[PDB]
Design a protein around this nucleic acid. Structure first.
Length: 49
DNA sequence: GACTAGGGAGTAATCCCCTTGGCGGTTAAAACGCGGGGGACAGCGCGTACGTGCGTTTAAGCGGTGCTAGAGCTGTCTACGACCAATTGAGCGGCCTCGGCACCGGGATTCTCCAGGG
């Protein structure tokens, strides 16, 4: 769905994926193996980083 | 005068929202440990600034005096302050905003360390 929105429409602005903690890595890998044309951010890991 | 009709209280069933405990998940603050280095402190030397003895004087205590202007108490009155309430407005009790505060980001600016040569 997001890939279709990014291809058919010129809008691929910052979207949010709210997920449980356990799948936090899996999602960023889910379209790493799959469509990699997006820039993914992972938010976790102490205040510093 | 005998019995009739209707509605809010008495009795009761419904709802249902409100919390008592325990337990798991997850982030943040607290807890612990090492390399190394800068702060604490000894050993010491000294000089010069006081610690101390003695001469030679001004000065507080001494001893007394003659009063002098400010301080305590005696009437005495009278201007004023603590005694009811009508008031009626100065101001507080409860609610509704939008704005300054909360707080984080991009950047310019600034504060600090080093391994070398200069």
């Amino acid at each position: 769905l997001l890939a279709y929105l990014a291809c058919e429409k010129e809008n691929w602005g910052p979207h949010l994926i709210v997920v449980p903690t356990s799948v936090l890595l899996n999602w960023e890998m889910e379209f790493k193996r799959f469509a990699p044309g997006f820039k993914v951010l992972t938010y976790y890991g102490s205040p510093q980083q």
